[PDB]
PDB file of C-alpha atoms in Angstrom:
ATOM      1  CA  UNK A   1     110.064  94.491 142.591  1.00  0.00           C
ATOM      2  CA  UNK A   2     113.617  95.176 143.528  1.00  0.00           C
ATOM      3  CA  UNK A   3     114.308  95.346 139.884  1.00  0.00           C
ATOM      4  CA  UNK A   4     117.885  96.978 139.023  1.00  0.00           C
ATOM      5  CA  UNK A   5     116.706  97.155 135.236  1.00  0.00           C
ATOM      6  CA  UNK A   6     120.543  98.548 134.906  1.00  0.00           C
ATOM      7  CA  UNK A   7     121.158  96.436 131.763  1.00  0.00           C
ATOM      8  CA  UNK A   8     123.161  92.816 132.672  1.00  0.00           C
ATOM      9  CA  UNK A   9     124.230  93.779 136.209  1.00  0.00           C
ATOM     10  CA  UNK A  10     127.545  92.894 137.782  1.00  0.00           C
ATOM     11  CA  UNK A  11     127.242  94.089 141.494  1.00  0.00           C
ATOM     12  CA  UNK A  12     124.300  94.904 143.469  1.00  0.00           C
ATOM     13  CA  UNK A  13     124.903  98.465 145.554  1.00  0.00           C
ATOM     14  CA  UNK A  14     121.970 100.100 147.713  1.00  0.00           C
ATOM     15  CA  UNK A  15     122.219 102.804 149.587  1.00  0.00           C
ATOM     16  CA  UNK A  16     120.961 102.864 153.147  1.00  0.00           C
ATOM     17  CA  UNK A  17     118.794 105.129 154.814  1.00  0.00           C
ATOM     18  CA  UNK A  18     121.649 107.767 155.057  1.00  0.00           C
ATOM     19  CA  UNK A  19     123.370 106.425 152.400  1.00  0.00           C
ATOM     20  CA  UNK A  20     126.222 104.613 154.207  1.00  0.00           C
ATOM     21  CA  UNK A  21     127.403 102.366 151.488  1.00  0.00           C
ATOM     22  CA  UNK A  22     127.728 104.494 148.989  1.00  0.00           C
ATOM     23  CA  UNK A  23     128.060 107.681 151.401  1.00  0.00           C
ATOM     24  CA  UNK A  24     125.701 109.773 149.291  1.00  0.00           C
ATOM     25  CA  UNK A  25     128.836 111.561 147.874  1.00  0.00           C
ATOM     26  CA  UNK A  26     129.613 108.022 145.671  1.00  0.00           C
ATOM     27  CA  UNK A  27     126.777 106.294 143.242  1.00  0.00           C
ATOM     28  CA  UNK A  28     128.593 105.427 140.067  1.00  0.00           C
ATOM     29  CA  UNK A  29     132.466 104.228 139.481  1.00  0.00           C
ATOM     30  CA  UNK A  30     133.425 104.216 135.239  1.00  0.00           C
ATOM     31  CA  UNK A  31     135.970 105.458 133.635  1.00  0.00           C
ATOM     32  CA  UNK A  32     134.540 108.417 132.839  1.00  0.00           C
ATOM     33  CA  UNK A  33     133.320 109.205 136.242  1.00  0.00           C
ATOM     34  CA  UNK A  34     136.539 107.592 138.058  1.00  0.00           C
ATOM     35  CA  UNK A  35     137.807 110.728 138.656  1.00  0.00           C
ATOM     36  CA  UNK A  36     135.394 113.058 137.202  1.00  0.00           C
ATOM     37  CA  UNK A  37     132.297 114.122 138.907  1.00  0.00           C
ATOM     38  CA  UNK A  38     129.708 111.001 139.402  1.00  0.00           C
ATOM     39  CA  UNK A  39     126.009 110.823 138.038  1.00  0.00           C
ATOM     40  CA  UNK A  40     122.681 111.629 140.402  1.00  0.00           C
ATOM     41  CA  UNK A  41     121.328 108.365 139.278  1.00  0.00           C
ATOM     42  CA  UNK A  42     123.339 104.986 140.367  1.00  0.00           C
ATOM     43  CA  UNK A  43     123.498 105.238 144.216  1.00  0.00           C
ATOM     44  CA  UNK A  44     120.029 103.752 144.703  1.00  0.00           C
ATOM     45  CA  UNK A  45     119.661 100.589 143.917  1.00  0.00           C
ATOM     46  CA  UNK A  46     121.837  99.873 140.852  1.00  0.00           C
ATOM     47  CA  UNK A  47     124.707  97.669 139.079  1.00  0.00           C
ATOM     48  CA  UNK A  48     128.050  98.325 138.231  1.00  0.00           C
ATOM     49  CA  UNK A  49     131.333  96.672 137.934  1.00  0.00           C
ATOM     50  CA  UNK A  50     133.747  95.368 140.746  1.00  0.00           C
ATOM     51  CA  UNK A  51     136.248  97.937 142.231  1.00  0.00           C
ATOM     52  CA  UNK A  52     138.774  97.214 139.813  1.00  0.00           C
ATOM     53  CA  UNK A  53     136.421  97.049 137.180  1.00  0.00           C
ATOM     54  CA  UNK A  54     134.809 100.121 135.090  1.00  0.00           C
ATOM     55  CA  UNK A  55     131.625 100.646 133.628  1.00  0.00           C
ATOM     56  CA  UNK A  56     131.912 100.613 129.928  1.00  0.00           C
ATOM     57  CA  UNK A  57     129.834 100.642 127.236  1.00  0.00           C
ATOM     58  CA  UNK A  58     127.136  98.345 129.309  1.00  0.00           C
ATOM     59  CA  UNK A  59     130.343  96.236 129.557  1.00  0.00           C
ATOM     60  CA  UNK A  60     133.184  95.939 132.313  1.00  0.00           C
ATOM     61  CA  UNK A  61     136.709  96.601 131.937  1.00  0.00           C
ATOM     62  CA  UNK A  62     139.616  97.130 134.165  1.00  0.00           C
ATOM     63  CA  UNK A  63     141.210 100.608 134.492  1.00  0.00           C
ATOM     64  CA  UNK A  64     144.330 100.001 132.643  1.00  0.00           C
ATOM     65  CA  UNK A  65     141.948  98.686 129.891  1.00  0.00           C
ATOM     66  CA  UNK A  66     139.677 101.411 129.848  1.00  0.00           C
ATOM     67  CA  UNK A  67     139.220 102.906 126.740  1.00  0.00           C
ATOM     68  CA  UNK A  68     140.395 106.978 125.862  1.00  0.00           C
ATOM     69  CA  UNK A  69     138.894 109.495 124.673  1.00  0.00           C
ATOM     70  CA  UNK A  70     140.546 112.291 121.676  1.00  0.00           C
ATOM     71  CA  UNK A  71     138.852 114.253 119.422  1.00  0.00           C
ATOM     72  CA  UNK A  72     135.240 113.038 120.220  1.00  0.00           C
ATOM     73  CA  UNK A  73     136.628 109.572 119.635  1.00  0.00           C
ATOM     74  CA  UNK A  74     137.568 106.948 121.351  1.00  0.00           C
ATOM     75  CA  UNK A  75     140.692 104.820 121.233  1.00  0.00           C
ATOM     76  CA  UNK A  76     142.413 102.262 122.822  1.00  0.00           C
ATOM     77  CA  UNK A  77     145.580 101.610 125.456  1.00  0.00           C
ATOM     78  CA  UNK A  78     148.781 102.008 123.564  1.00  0.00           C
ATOM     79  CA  UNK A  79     146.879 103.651 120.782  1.00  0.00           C
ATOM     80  CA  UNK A  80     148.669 106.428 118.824  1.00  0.00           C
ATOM     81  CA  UNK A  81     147.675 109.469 117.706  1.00  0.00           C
ATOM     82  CA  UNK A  82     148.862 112.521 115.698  1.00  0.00           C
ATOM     83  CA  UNK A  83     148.415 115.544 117.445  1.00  0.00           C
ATOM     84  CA  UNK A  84     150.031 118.890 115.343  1.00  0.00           C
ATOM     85  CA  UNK A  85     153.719 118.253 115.673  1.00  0.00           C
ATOM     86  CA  UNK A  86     153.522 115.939 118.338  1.00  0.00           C
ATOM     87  CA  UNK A  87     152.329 112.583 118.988  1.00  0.00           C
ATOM     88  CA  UNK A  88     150.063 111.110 122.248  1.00  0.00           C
ATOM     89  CA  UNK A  89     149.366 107.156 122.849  1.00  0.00           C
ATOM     90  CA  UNK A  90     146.936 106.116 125.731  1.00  0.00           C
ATOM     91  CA  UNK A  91     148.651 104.569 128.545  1.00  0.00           C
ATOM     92  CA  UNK A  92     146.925 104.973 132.199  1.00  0.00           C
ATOM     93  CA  UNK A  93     144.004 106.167 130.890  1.00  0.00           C
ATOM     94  CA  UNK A  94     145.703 109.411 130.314  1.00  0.00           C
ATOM     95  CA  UNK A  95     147.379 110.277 126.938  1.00  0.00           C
ATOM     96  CA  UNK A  96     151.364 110.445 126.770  1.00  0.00           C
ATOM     97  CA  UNK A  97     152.800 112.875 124.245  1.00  0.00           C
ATOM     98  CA  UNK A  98     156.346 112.328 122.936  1.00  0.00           C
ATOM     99  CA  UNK A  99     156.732 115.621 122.483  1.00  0.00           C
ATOM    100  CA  UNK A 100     159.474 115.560 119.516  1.00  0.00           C
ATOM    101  CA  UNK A 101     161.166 117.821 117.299  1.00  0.00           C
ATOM    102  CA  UNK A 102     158.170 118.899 115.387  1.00  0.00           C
ATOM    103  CA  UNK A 103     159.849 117.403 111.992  1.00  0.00           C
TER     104      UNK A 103
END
């Protein structure tokens, strides 16, 4: 029935016979996946967000909102954390250490 299933779904992408649209090599675009390897399932028929959204949590967020990952936790943008002697705070979806005199 053409069903995407794919929880509340954003955009509708297919892929074609060959898999133009999502060129076989693409079927899922999150935060997680952005840059990291992508999952088997999503390139046929299936729901995600808009280019410069991110799949998140069933919900969509932009990049520089994403959420970040430390310690098997995850934080926020401009969220701080303590790391030994140094400190990091999410900021591009990548942490940024100060790197200080540790104390």
């Amino acid at each position: 029935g053409a069903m995407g299933s794919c929880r509340p779904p954003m955009v509708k992408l297919v892929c074609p016979a060959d898999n133009l649209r999502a060129e076989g090599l693409e079927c899922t675009k999150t935060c997680q996946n952005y840059d990291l390897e992508c999952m088997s399932m999503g390139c046929v028929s299936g729901c995600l967000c808009p280019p410069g959204m991110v799949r998140h949590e069933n919900r969509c967020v932009a990049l520089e909102r994403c959420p970040c990952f430390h310690q098997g936790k995850e934080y926020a943008p401009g969220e701080t954390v303590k790391i030994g002697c140094n400190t990091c705070v999410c900021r591009d979806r990548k942490w940024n250490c100060t790197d200080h005199v540790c104390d």
